[PDB]
Design a binder for this molecule. Structure first.
Ligand code: NA
Length: 155
């Protein structure tokens, strides 16, 4: 009902569509944001979300690669919150490596739930701008629906 959504350009793209579905969502998207820049923000802005019973959506990696250690530092900073971690689809050589880090984090952590946008958007070029980074409306609605459906299942 009041989840935190933190991400890069993709969060900017879906913010308005997502707010129509979940009006009390707290949305923090910034074009060009790197995952390593999110951890100080969570400590400066969002420690009230780092609690059992809170919900956080993390949408990072589309705008740049990150390391295992950086991902773990970010996930640890949310504490016992339920974390919905979105896989990425981007035309860059690091896409697979980052998606494997994301997959393994979800495998490990009982409070991390994978939102497999990579799999969901396979075969749907109409979801994406020609740059393969920004989303068309059809993509923003599909990703919004996937995030919300995952949170409603608790999966
Ligand atoms: Na998990």
């Amino acid at each position: 009902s009041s989840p935190l959504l933190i991400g890069d350009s993709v969060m900017v793209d879906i913010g308005n569509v997502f707010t129509k579905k979940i009006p009390n969502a707290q949305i923090d998207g910034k074009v060009g944001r790197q995952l390593v820049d999110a951890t100080p923000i969570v400590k400066s802005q969002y420690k009230d979300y780092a609690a059992a019973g809170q919900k956080v959506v993390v949408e990072l990696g589309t705008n740049g690669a990150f390391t295992k250690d950086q991902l773990n530092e970010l996930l640890d900073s949310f504490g016992k919150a339920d974390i919905y971690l979105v896989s990425i689809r981007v035309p860059r050589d690091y896409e697979g490596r980052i998606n494997k880090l994301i997959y393994e984090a979800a495998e490990k952590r009982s409070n991390v739930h994978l939102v497999d946008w990579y799999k969901a958007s396979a075969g749907h070029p109409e979801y994406f701008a020609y740059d393969g980074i920004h989303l068309e409306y059809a993509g923003s609605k599909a990703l919004t629906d996937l995030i919300v459906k995952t949170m409603e299942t608790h999966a």
